[PDB]
């Protein structure tokens, strides 16, 4: 992908318009993004923005490396250790037991 775009900030107005999409039209872009990515790439959770992402430990009720129980799912009742954050859907990623 030869663009040189990583060296200059051109089209600031257009970039801001694309990056500040109205919240009520988000499903429009969500649809194409989801249907244009492979199954092993995509996740079933809604991507979040800065104003609602968990940026502090108090917001993240759990921190990677602590045991937890999973319920309301196929692995209901399984005990696993959250291996890391997601930073994209405000979610956790567990170990193989999850």
């Amino acid at each position: 992908s030869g663009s040189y775009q990583h060296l200059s900030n051109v089209g600031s107005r257009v970039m801001k318009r694309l990056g500040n999409r109205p919240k009520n039209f988000l499903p429009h872009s969500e649809k194409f993004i989801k249907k244009s990515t492979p199954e092993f790439m995509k996740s079933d959770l809604k991507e979040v923005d800065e104003k609602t992402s968990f940026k502090s430990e108090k917001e993240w009720k759990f921190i990677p490396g602590d045991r937890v129980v999973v319920m309301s799912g196929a692995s209901k009742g399984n005990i696993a250790v959250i291996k890391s954050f997601d930073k994209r859907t405000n979610s956790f990623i567990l170990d193989e037991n999850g």
Binding site: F40, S43, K83, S84, D86, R88, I93
Partner: peptide, 15 residues
Amino acid sequence: DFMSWFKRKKQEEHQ
């Protein structure tokens, strides 16, 4: 993400 999981699994295998 899958990227991070794959990376850490590569590192785990190397360890």
